[PDB]
Design a protein around this ligand. Structure first.
Ligand SMILES: CC(C)(COP(=O)(O)OP(=O)(O)OC[C@H]1O[C@@H](n2cnc3c(N)ncnc32)[C@H](O)[C@@H]1O)[C@@H](O)C(=O)NCCC(=O)NCCS
Ligand SMILES: CC(C)(COP(=O)(O)OP(=O)(O)OC[C@H]1O[C@@H](n2cnc3c(N)ncnc32)[C@H](O)[C@@H]1O)[C@@H](O)C(=O)NCCC(=O)NCCS
Ligand SMILES: [Zn+2]
Ligand SMILES: [Zn+2]
Ligand SMILES: [Zn+2]
Ligand SMILES: [Zn+2]
Lengths: 374, 374
């Protein structure tokens, strides 16, 4: 009975910087031409959402944030072809228009229709579908998943297997696919290779999972917090190392450990230093280092281009280099064929209403991933 | 009549830093086990040789320098298999032992037996084959081509077509193959792509030649010296641009010129800034920038890793990523099949004795490439 009209619901609104989320009553306008509207069933709490809170990921406020989710379609706008009423779905914070330079390219995925580079906090048409007390509220990354209902453009949503556990596959919306993809799509880890992951939060662990998926003989986890190590070895990390145990700087140890450098390194932290370390520790002639994480601060690093001239490759990606609308339904299909498990990434589950609690568990470094449910 | 014994000849000896080369009489010891000895017919004057002179490429002195050459084998040591007496050859400043981690790898070429990283200025065995007045003199990059006679290890020499004009194919020893290879092996330039070359000396021109060889629709030459432009368009550059004509910084102009960024950029200069420019000006999602040239100074650059995170790739190479002993005889074969011309790269020819004159023509930026002949 909701199709074609306004829905009154609860959302999590960030009125301004450095404040908690307030649960407010919200009006969600119905989907216009080429727009879908979705009943959220589960959303993950990711780092970038916290960066919205500190003001270090600059997007316009007030905003309904949140970008890692799954749910079910409530209705569709005119001429929507890719999804139907009731289809389970995952919003795509990196779109796939299928028509830009980037979408047409065989390697690229950072669709030119993205809202990441200079965020507008709107739908593709320049307007908002959310009001609170008549005050309009911005979208976030064309997703905005901190709400019982959202509306997104067709190029920001993917149909998925009608039977997927939405509490679990929502991780394919961001944290999993960002890490997994960094290893299997971007870096193209190969049989028997030696990998080295920097940062053992959930993206890092998904990287490790991507490195094991490829046939890596050695997967060296690096982190300053000991407590992250069990889980990493559980997911495939053959070895772990904590830089603060050592006298020598860690690329020096990782180089002698790997007999003159690793095949593939991954920076999954988001300090500046650690990116340089990771590049240096790969084999001088043919090593590949991948930037997964970055600080949102956006600052400049210092580095010796001698490291590249010997033959090293330094690259990075968003959303694990995955073309979003092609990839997500196959990535979920791969979960249902049991070609990897998601449980290890899910440490805390909460009702949507204790969103603020979940964000306390990320800031204290206790959560790998909190899931909010509806 | 020279096989198995000492040869008295002329060489160009650098007794110390920041002095001209002196023509001295030299004793060249005969080849030991697995060593070749070569009568030079032509050597090129490259930048790195001048960097030896200023003390900015640190190798031990005194030294017979020079690394871009061809010649003819005078004799061979025991158990040498790859070459015979009288075979025309090109010394390889980057070896191919065929046995290290790097040589065994399918992408790598920076053989671990190289003398580039921490130069010893010797043969592979740790000794010198050159004396002047009984004072021993170091080798350079296991080549030392500023001499009527040299001796190199078997893994630093390549047999070539018995009919090649040695005045011309010597360029495959360094400057040509460094540029050409950067485009066709390293970067893997593709059909119809948009290329952008920074620096239009002879390596840069060889890059341009490598970009035209691949099927590039657009090849944008960049240089601060107007006078380099005719030659670049001659070799395939479809367009040229001089940053000092403009108000906007050049990646900003190159970005609007290329409709949002080039497919492949190449830094072939060796300042720090220009490497960053070149990376920035390639397309954010799928662009590839290649470091060919570097300053020998070895300093640190400043850079925003946001540029990589969007999907950019930043890599570099020595000797155009070419596996030296496999590549040189096929690269020369490709010259004799007339699949590219070398004449455009050769601006000045001189007798070996006016070596100092040729080095004056590089420092004043008048030479693209001076060839010394014997
Ligand atoms: C860092 C990213 C990848 C999230 O990763 P993750 O969820 O694993 O964050 P988390 O902090 O939990 O994990 C990083 C790990 O680094 C460790 N760490 C912190 N400092 C150090 C250090 N000096 N040395 C080693 N490890 C460290 C922490 O212990 C932690 O385990 C994310 O913030 C990011 O930068 N993504 C970039 C891509 C992007 O912007 N996409 C848009 C949607 S997110
Ligand atoms: C620079 C290298 C590649 C030699 O190239 P080349 O012979 O073309 O040198 P050359 O100076 O003639 O050419 C560079 C060009 O840059 C131009 N240039 C100088 N400054 C600028 C600037 N600010 N902007 C644009 N162009 C510039 C010059 O006009 C010149 O034409 C070489 O020095 C090098 O760094 N090689 C690294 C690999 C290596 O060490 N291998 C070992 C054997 S050499
Ligand atoms: Zn697109
Ligand atoms: Zn995320
Ligand atoms: Zn080798
Ligand atoms: Zn050279």
């Amino acid at each position: 009975s909701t199709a074609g009209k306004v829905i009154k619901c609860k959302a999590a609104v960030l009125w301004e910087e450095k404040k908690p989320f307030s649960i407010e009553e919200v009006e969600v306008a119905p989907p216009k031409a080429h727009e879908v509207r979705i009943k959220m069933v589960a959303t993950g709490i990711c780092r970038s959402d916290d960066h919205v809170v500190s003001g270090t990921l600059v997007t316009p406020l007030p905003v309904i944030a949140g970008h890692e989710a799954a749910g079910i379609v409530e209705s569709i706008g005119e001429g929507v072809t890719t999804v139907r009423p009731g289809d389970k779905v995952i919003p795509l914070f990196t779109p796939q228009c299928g028509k830009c330079r980037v979408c047409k390219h065989p390697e690229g995925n950072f669709c030119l229709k993205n809202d990441l580079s200079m965020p507008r906090g709107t739908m593709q048409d320049g307007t908002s579908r959310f009001t609170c007390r008549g005050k309009p509220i911005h979208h976030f990354l064309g997703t905005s998943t901190f709400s019982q209902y959202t509306v997104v453009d067709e190029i920001s949503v993917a149909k998925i297997d009608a039977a997927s556990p939405l509490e679990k596959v929502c991780l394919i919306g961001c944290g999993f696919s960002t890490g997994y993809g960094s290893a299997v799509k971007v870096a193209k880890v190969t049989q028997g290779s030696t990998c080295a992951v920097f940062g053992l939060g959930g993206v890092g662990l998904s990287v490790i999972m991507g490195c094991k998926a490829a046939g890596a003989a050695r997967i060296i986890g690096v982190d300053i917090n000991k407590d992250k190590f069990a889980k990493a070895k559980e997911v495939g990390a053959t070895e772990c190392v904590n830089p603060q145990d050592y006298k020598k700087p860690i690329q020096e140890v990782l180089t002698e450990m790997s007999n003159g450098g690793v095949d593939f390194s991954f920076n999954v932290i988001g300090r500046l230093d650690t990116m340089v370390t990771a590049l240096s520790c790969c084999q001088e002639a043919y090593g590949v280092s991948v930037i997964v994480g970055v600080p949102p601060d956006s600052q400049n690093l210092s580095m010796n281009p001698m490291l590249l001239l010997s033959g090293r490759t330094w690259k990075g990606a968003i959303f694990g280099g995955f073309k979003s609308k092609d990839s997500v339904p196959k990535l979920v299909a791969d979960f249902m064929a049991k070609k990897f498990a998601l449980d290890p990434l899910i440490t805390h589950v909460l009702p949507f209403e204790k969103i603020n609690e979940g964000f306390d568990l990320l800031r204290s470094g206790e959560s790998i991933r909190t899931i909010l449910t509806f």
